[model samples]
Target: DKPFNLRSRDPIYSNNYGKLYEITPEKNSQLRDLDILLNCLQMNEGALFVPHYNSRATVILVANEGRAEVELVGLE
Candidate 1:
């Protein structure tokens, strides 16, 4: 997320509710453009990230803020 820093307009989307960063084969590569080792997620007590997946990625999360209780399905 360096050359295509997370602060970039095309990479960031936010509002009073939440923020989102888009990752695809086009925008950056490497993790899109170069190598990426970090990712971020934000939420409240009742927040949800919905369901999703990627071809060659694992969910690496950090308990940075509020308490999180993730109900993971499959991937075992």
Candidate 2:
């Protein structure tokens, strides 16, 4: 697969926000639920995960190869 970049922000409920970075790739089968994962991140304050909020609804650039780093720009 091609090398790509991915990014995102923490939701309003999340404590950590305004953070951003690149993510590494992992195996596809290892992936899990996006919403649950995001919720977990919100619970944890902030963290990196596969960005599912994009229009494509596909994995983020960092996650394209199965890995990606995300940011927390707060809620929309």
How far in Å is the alpha carbon of 57 misplaced in model 1?
A: 1.0
Candidate 1 global TM-score: 0.52
Question: Using alpha carbons, what is the TM-score of model 2?
Answer: 0.17
The number of residue pairs in model 2 that clash at the backbone is 15
For residues 7-43, what per-residue lDDT tens digits would candidate 1 score against the true structure?
Answer: 4543344544566655545555567445554444545
Kindly report which residue stretches of model 1 are placed more than 4 angstroms away from their true locations once superposed.
Answer: 1-5, 8-16, 22-34
Which candidate should be chosen as best, given TM-score against the real structure?
Answer: 1
lDDT of 1 at 19: 62
lDDT of 2 at 11: 40
Model 2's lDDT to the true fold?
A: 0.33
